[PDB]
Scaffold this active site. Structure first.
Site, PDB file in Angstrom:
ATOM      1  N   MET A 210     -31.737 -41.175  53.974  1.00  0.00           N
ATOM      2  CA  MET A 210     -31.383 -42.534  53.589  1.00  0.00           C
ATOM      3  C   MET A 210     -29.980 -43.061  53.965  1.00  0.00           C
ATOM      4  SD  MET A 210     -30.681 -43.042  49.788  1.00  0.00           S
ATOM      5  CE  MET A 210     -30.436 -44.559  50.141  1.00  0.00           C
TER       6      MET A 210
ATOM      7  N   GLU B  24     -27.694 -46.985  54.078  1.00  0.00           N
ATOM      8  CA  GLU B  24     -27.496 -48.581  53.327  1.00  0.00           C
ATOM      9  C   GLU B  24     -29.039 -48.697  52.301  1.00  0.00           C
ATOM     10  OE1 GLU B  24     -27.036 -48.739  56.163  1.00  0.00           O
ATOM     11  OE2 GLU B  24     -27.678 -50.763  56.995  1.00  0.00           O
TER      12      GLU B  24
ATOM     13  N   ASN C 138     -35.107 -42.650  57.655  1.00  0.00           N
ATOM     14  CA  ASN C 138     -35.187 -41.665  58.316  1.00  0.00           C
ATOM     15  C   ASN C 138     -35.959 -40.560  58.158  1.00  0.00           C
ATOM     16  OD1 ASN C 138     -35.152 -40.302  61.006  1.00  0.00           O
ATOM     17  ND2 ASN C 138     -32.861 -40.424  61.220  1.00  0.00           N
TER      18      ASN C 138
ATOM     19  N   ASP D 245     -28.718 -57.772  59.976  1.00  0.00           N
ATOM     20  CA  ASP D 245     -28.122 -57.331  58.803  1.00  0.00           C
ATOM     21  C   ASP D 245     -28.756 -58.356  58.205  1.00  0.00           C
ATOM     22  OD1 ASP D 245     -28.069 -54.806  59.658  1.00  0.00           O
ATOM     23  OD2 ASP D 245     -25.547 -55.081  58.929  1.00  0.00           O
TER      24      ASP D 245
HETATM   25  O1  LIG Z   1     -25.446 -40.688  57.326  1.00  0.00           O
HETATM   26  C1  LIG Z   1     -26.682 -41.408  58.018  1.00  0.00           C
HETATM   27  C2  LIG Z   1     -27.720 -42.161  57.210  1.00  0.00           C
HETATM   28  O2  LIG Z   1     -28.626 -41.736  57.770  1.00  0.00           O
HETATM   29  C3  LIG Z   1     -29.637 -41.132  58.174  1.00  0.00           C
HETATM   30  O3  LIG Z   1     -30.258 -41.732  59.496  1.00  0.00           O
HETATM   31  C4  LIG Z   1     -31.092 -42.145  57.225  1.00  0.00           C
HETATM   32  O4  LIG Z   1     -31.312 -43.843  58.250  1.00  0.00           O
HETATM   33  C5  LIG Z   1     -29.709 -40.258  57.819  1.00  0.00           C
HETATM   34  O5  LIG Z   1     -29.152 -39.523  58.105  1.00  0.00           O
HETATM   35  C6  LIG Z   1     -28.333 -40.309  56.626  1.00  0.00           C
HETATM   36  O6  LIG Z   1     -28.044 -39.962  54.959  1.00  0.00           O
HETATM   37  O1  LIG Z   2     -28.998 -52.471  60.787  1.00  0.00           O
HETATM   38  C1  LIG Z   2     -28.782 -51.478  60.189  1.00  0.00           C
HETATM   39  C2  LIG Z   2     -27.284 -51.401  59.500  1.00  0.00           C
HETATM   40  O2  LIG Z   2     -26.653 -49.384  60.216  1.00  0.00           O
HETATM   41  C3  LIG Z   2     -26.014 -50.003  61.245  1.00  0.00           C
HETATM   42  O3  LIG Z   2     -27.026 -48.950  62.401  1.00  0.00           O
HETATM   43  C4  LIG Z   2     -24.560 -49.262  60.689  1.00  0.00           C
HETATM   44  O4  LIG Z   2     -24.361 -48.622  61.204  1.00  0.00           O
HETATM   45  C5  LIG Z   2     -26.283 -50.930  61.471  1.00  0.00           C
HETATM   46  O5  LIG Z   2     -27.551 -50.637  61.936  1.00  0.00           O
HETATM   47  C6  LIG Z   2     -26.256 -51.773  60.612  1.00  0.00           C
HETATM   48  O6  LIG Z   2     -25.077 -51.900  59.980  1.00  0.00           O
END
Ligand SMILES: OC[C@H]1O[C@](O)(CO)[C@@H](O)[C@@H]1O
Ligand SMILES: OC[C@H]1O[C@](O)(CO)[C@@H](O)[C@@H]1O
Ligand code: NA
Length: 493
Positions: free
Chosen positions: A18, A20, A38, A153
């Protein structure tokens, strides 16, 4: 690690990775949590919105993917909101729709556009709007010098005073947000940019603007409110790297005017692992709390966990209040936590002196330990958590320079990333009675440390062995009187 370091009272995805949180919203008596998911569980996997729900912000029920990646388009971050008047026409009068706006990322071309989904079963299932994208790369290009690779975002909320939907978009290394208005949630019009260069007191080092949120906060108690924009810039935080900050100002429905900012009060966390914070919208007034959560993993794929990666922070309130005569943003774990914890040890009015070690009988890896104390001048109070033979994570209060510090040089496995160890600090003063307060949520692989009324916060991942489950409370350079200590175990049940 026996148990893949699974937190026992923090959210983690039922499987895989996960990032954000997304679309934080309360619907009826249900708190909705989405997040960047993911399921491929490697760095090249496609992102969708994962989904979980609870009635108490603590017992989460995992749900299927809510917004899938489809047709080469991944579902990047965004926010949600209720459309009670059906201004979108996507529901009907019988049930107005709940709405989610998210960035569509076309993997092959890397374009970023804005998309809509809607739910008419109160957030159970989500449908992508047939007219997607609602904001195309063509519409973004006059405001995005990459031509639509750096616009993402969307934070969206209904602005009562002006009668329009408001969309706030982040622009990455262009170091600005853009403000857009709509009447129907679908057809948007650019109004303004809020640029780093326009915000007095905001350093040049603060770059890579992502994950905006926007809301009104009561400004202490004082019958007046203020607008808050919160975001996660990729650079410039106290512990270095990505971080969460908040800025007050006024909003007229088209543009945001920031107050001067002060670097010493703008950041919402001084640790490594609290990033991409959002707040729950649609919280009824009888509750009235501003509650935020973020992901705790600043190390991408490096955390030594296999069946999952990324954990949600424990939900905490955000408020503005006077600490001394300075107005601070202040954060505290939600009071719901008190319903799932039990005291293992309580101390009242106990003197601690150099040479003693208190809390030596405690064993636990899931603890919520308050300490409130009157330290001697030049004393250093130390609380070691997750303590074993050669492992410990040490929280210190240094009286002489009023510093709360969290020291991970001996936490356990700090080999997984160069930034896994070291020491993080935050400014923390005695109150006017001379009382210093500190609270630490300890879990399988984390600490979240709150100082004072919550003016200071340090959230960090740690990876101790399971047998590293002791505490040690000591003092050097002086005595302290411990007004209270409440070591509680925490269990979801
Ligand atoms: O640190 C990047 C973060 O995003 C991910 O691809 C999931 O969306 C995880 O690998 C990880 O927790
Ligand atoms: O949009 C999804 C979020 O995760 C990010 O990759 C941040 O690295 C951008 O995609 C955005 O801030
Ligand atoms: Na960070």
């Amino acid at each position: 690690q026996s148990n893949d370091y699974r937190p026992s009272y923090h959210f983690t995805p039922d499987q895989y990775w996960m990032n954000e949180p997304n679309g934080l919203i309360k619907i009826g008596s249900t708190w909705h949590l989405f997040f960047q998911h993911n399921p491929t569980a490697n760095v090249w996997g496609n992102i969708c919105w994962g989904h979980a729900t609870s009635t108490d912000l603590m017992h989460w029920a995992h749900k299927p993917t809510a917004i899938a990646d489809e047709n080469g388009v991944e579902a990047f971050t965004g926010t949600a909101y209720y459309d009670p008047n059906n201004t979108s026409g996507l529901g009907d009068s019988a049930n107005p729709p709940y709405l989610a706006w998210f960035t569509g990322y076309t993997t092959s071309s890397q374009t970023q556009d804005q998309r809509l989904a809607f739910s008419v079963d109160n957030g159970a299932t989500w449908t992508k709007f047939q007219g997607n994208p609602i904001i195309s790369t063509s519409q973004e290009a006059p405001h995005d010098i990459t031509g639509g690779l750096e616009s993402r975002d969307p934070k969206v909320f209904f602005h009562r005073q002006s009668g329009n939907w408001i969309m706030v978009l982040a622009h990455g290394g262009q170091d600005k947000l853009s403000f857009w208005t709509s009447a129907d949630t679908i057809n948007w019009t650019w109004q303004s940019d809020l640029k780093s260069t326009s915000i007095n007191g905001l350093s040049s080092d603060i770059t890579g603007w992502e994950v905006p949120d926007m809301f009104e906060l009561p400004v202490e108690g004082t019958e007046e409110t203020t607008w808050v924009v919160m975001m996660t810039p990729a650079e410039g935080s106290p512990a270095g790297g990505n971080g969460v900050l908040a800025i007050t100002g006024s909003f007229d429905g088209k543009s945001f005017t920031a107050d001067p900012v002060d670097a010493s009060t703008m950041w919402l966390d001084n640790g490594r692992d609290f990033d991409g914070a959002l707040s729950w919208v649609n919280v009824p007034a009888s509750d009235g709390r501003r509650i935020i959560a973020a992901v705790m993993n600043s190390y991408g794929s490096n955390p030594p966990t296999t069946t999952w990666k990324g954990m949600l922070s424990f939900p905490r309130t955000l408020s503005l209040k006077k600490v001394g005569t300075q107005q601070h943003f202040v954060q505290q774990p939600i009071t719901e936590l008190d319903t799932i914890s039990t005291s293992l040890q309580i101390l009242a009015n106990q003197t601690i002196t150099p040479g003693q070690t208190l809390l030596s009988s405690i064993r636990g890896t899931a603890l919520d330990v308050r300490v409130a104390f009157y330290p001697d001048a030049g004393s250093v109070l130390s609380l070691a958590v997750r303590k074993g033979a050669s492992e410990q994570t040490v929280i210190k209060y240094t009286q002489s320079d009023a510093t709360l510090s969290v020291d991970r040089t001996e936490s356990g496995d700090i080999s997984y990333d160069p930034a896994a160890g070291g020491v993080h600090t935050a400014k923390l003063e005695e109150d006017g009675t001379g009382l210093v307060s500190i609270r630490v949520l300890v879990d399988t692989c984390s600490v979240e440390v709150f100082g004072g009324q919550g003016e200071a916060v340090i959230s960090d991942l740690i990876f101790p062995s399971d047998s590293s489950d002791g505490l040690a409370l000591e003092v050097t350079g002086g005595n302290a009187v411990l007004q209270s200590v409440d070591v509680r175990s925490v269990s979801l049940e």
